[PDB]
């Protein structure tokens, strides 16, 4: 496995701009050495949970691909970024599979994503006809039809525009503050491994 380039974890974690959770961002990481040590002992991360593998063993592991999904939600919703969860985020925005293999990291981004008066650029989907399949993404803006009456593309009675804005303000309480979230998915196929820890 001839690999000498380091995986671009800093490009993901240290980006200036994060996507709204309904249009969540995905970067494919392959063909590189993954130095997870820059993630260890962070004074920033309020959530570091892994699934299927132990964090302590990440430098000894090889994967066919790694996927870096990133987005912003509110603090109270970080718990939904996990297998088996339910809620507006898990049902309508970002869904992890029951057999998820990977890690979920999150940190408070009040200093970057709040604005006195309200930062209305971060949206989430509130209504949807059915729940998302794992790793599905829905960016439609079709008016949600809540009654027997067709909506004909216009908001109204029983006819709601499906996205809603977080409107983050720095004075919000912690549960309503913006959190930046990175989901690393460790994909293993019947193919040679392209992402490996420094110890492999």
């Amino acid at each position, epitope marked *: 496995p001839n690999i000498t380039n380091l995986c671009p974890f800093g490009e993901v974690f240290n980006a200036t701009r994060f996507a709204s959770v309904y249009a969540w961002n995905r970067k494919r990481i392959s063909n590189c050495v993954a130095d*997870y*040590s820059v993630l*260890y002992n962070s004074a920033s991360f309020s959530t570091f*949970k892994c699934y299927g*593998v132990s*964090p*302590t063993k990440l430098n000894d592991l090889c994967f066919t691909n790694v996927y870096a999904d990133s987005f912003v939600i509110r603090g109270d919703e970080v718990r939904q970024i*996990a297998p088996g969860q339910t809620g507006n985020i898990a049902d309508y925005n970002y869904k992890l599979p029951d*057999d998820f293999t990977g890690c979920v990291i999150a940190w408070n981004s009040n200093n970057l994503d709040s604005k006195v008066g309200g930062n209305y650029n971060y949206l989430y989907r509130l209504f949807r006809k059915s729940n998302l399949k794992p790793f599905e993404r829905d960016i439609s803006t079709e008016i949600y039809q809540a009654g027997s009456t067709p909506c004909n593309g216009v908001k109204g009675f029983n006819c709601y525009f499906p996205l809603q804005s977080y409107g983050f303000q720095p004075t919000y309480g912690v549960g309503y503050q913006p959190y930046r979230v990175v989901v690393l998915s460790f994909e293993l196929l019947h193919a040679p491994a392209t992402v490996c820890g420094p110890k492999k």
Partner: antibody, heavy 120, light 109 residues
Framework: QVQLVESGGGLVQPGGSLRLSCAASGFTFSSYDMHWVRQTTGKGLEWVSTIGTAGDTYYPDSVKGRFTISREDAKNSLYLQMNSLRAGDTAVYYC??????????????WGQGTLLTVSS | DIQMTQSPSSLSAAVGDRVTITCRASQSIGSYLNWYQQKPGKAPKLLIYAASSLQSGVPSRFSGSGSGTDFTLTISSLQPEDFAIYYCQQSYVSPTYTFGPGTKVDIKR
């Protein structure tokens, strides 16, 4: 024969601090993750802290900011510094070796426990 | 995290009896489940990992089965030295490993 031996438990006043030690023998200490797990009659077995082989430390929210795990591989030793102790921290504290078979992780070796009593 | 529940709470059985205790995870965890035995004054002892692999040195009368959310520990023939509390533990979510509340196995004589 793998052995783990805890030391340092005892009486400590609320708000005080205390260090627990665990001395390991019978294996290559540097090659394994080490853990602290506490036990109380009311809440059973509870994970307290973990240190890997890359300097990485992990704590539950109930413990972050108050406890610090560390290791001295040159002396095959594990430590848990504890600050701002509350009555609810009274427990038996075990050190435990972690290992894995494939992706499956387990605690294959435990110390004898050391009793921490937090009381004025 | 993931909550673990055990059944029964306690059990009285005779020597030679088949003992069966069950563990349930609050969500699907595949085979990421271990079983531990704890005798009075002693630390837990690993019996089973990966839901069904017998740890080295553990007697063969101990066995684990199950996948997903429900798991079972079985003692084929209860011996007196098996009096203890048995705990299950999910190894799916780290670092926040969580333990079941335990099942006490008393010996009837």
């Amino acid at each position: 024969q793998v052995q783990l031996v805890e030391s340092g438990g005892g009486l400590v006043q609320p708000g005080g601090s205390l260090r627990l030690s665990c001395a390991a023998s019978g294996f290559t200490f540097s090659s394994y993750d080490m853990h602290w797990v506490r036990q109380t009659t009311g809440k059973g077995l509870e994970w307290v802290s973990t240190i890997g082989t890359a300097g990485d430390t992990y704590y539950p929210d109930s413990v972050k900011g108050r406890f610090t795990i560390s290791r001295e591989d040159a002396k095959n030793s594990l430590y848990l510094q504890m600050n701002s102790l509350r009555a609810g921290d009274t427990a038996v504290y075990y050190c435990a070796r972690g290992d894995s078979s494939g992706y499956y992780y387990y605690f294959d070796y435990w110390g004898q426990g050391t009793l921490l009593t937090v009381s004025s | 995290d993931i909550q673990m529940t055990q059944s029964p709470s306690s059990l009285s059985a005779a020597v030679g009896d088949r003992v069966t205790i069950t563990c349930r995870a609050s969500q699907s965890i595949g085979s990421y489940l271990n079983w531990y035995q704890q005798k009075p004054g002693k630390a837990p002892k690993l019996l089973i990992y990966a839901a069904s692999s017998l740890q080295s040195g553990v007697p063969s009368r101990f066995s684990g089965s199950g996948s997903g959310t429900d798991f079972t520990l079985t003692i084929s023939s209860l011996q007196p030295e098996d009096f203890a509390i048995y705990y299950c533990q999910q190894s799916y979510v780290s670092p926040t490993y969580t333990f079941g509340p335990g099942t006490k196995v008393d010996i009837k004589r």
